[PDB]
């Protein structure tokens with residue numbers, strides 16, 4: 086891989102994300118790292134409006150720019166949702182709204198917290214000399230004490246990182262088809278199947294670090310957007326940048342590039358046909374970092390791995406390809422069970438539209454098998 090901002094150790098996630106901003110922005114960093122206290126004490130929204138308007142120009146690097154996106158993205162969800170009990174702000178104050186908006190446009194991302202903010206850039210190792218495992222890692226920002234945002238964000242990230250092992254194999258696959266190296270391609274496909282199988286065990290960590298009640302009744306609220314949302318029917322007003330209200334989707338792992346890229350690699354056309362599911366995953370590419378959505382584009386313009394394997398009448402190649410697809414079905418099926426426990430059952434003591442989305446996506450993946 087190249088300038089697509091993909092790391093051989095960490096994948097689509099951002100290696101060594103920046104923890105501190107320049108001292109120009111302590112009024113921002115102060116609010117973001119005390120979100121639990123300021124929300125509970127009802128002091129958050131006033132401290133948003135007591136801020137003055139800071140320029141973007143002192144955010145020099147890519148890392149500081151993305152950390153500043155994480156900082157302002159969190160404050161925005163906190164300001165808009167408050168303590169998450171239904172009273173919402175519809176006007177985002179200018180002294181935070183235009184710095185957020187100008188920064189979002191420099192990074193080609195929408196002015197709302199996305200996956201690449203709160204997962205791919207929201208982490209750090211405790212001891213930098215020990216490995217990437219849950220016990221040596223922490224998030225940088227949370228919303229409320231007990232919101233399980235750390236468990237939820239880190240376990241996502243750990244799955245993203247398990248998938249990095251398979252991403253570095255992708256160039257091997259295409260070179261092998263181009264150079265007509267069937268044994269090379271067979272081994273490459275088995276290697277990708279093996280990685281997707283290992284990423285399944287990483288999902289099991291979710292049960293030890295997230296509990297359904299807190300996730301459903303707290304974290305979910307701070308991840309909500311203002312598109313198709315009854316509470317903000319027309320969107321949100323970004324003071325002093327636009328005057329119209331604007332609607333942007335809440336956080337979704339449909340914004341994760343790692344499952345989209347394996348759908349594209351294998352020729353599982355998740356974005357084909359005029360269904361809501363295909364529509365939503367295409368729209369969510371606008372909420373990916375431009376470098377990552379460029380990488381999905383260049384995979385799509387390479388010749389299809391699926392029809393290469395079909396064109397050959399090769400049981401070995403067909404079995405290896407189906408191994409990868411079976412492993413994707415396994416992840417989405419385990420993930421579907423997670424959603425039953427963490428959304429469907431809590432909601433019972435909406436969710437059906439979410440299950441139906443995942444089931445459409447799993448059903449498409451299942452239909453891509455050969456034998």
Ligand code: HEM
Nearest residue numbers: 240241244245295337338339341344417423424427439446
């Ligand atoms: C408490 C744990 C989790 C819950 C309740 C949950 C729930 C959901 C829901 C409701 C969706 C619907 C689409 C959307 O709005 O994003 C979704 C999609 C998705 N989730 Fe999760 N999720 C959880 C954990 C994870 C983890 C750890 C990953 C690791 C990467 C992950 C990966 C995905 C992906 C890739 C999608 C897009 C659909 C697909 O490609 O199959 N999820 N999830």
Ligand SMILES: O[C@H](C[C@H]1c2c(F)cccc2-c2cncn21)C1CCCCC1
Nearest residue numbers: 200203204238241305308335336337338
């Ligand atoms: O699935 C998204 C949340 C999303 C998400 C983030 F917004 C941030 C970090 C990880 C994830 C995630 C992982 N799987 C789904 N999602 C929400 C949809 C509405 C119900 C609550 C979950």
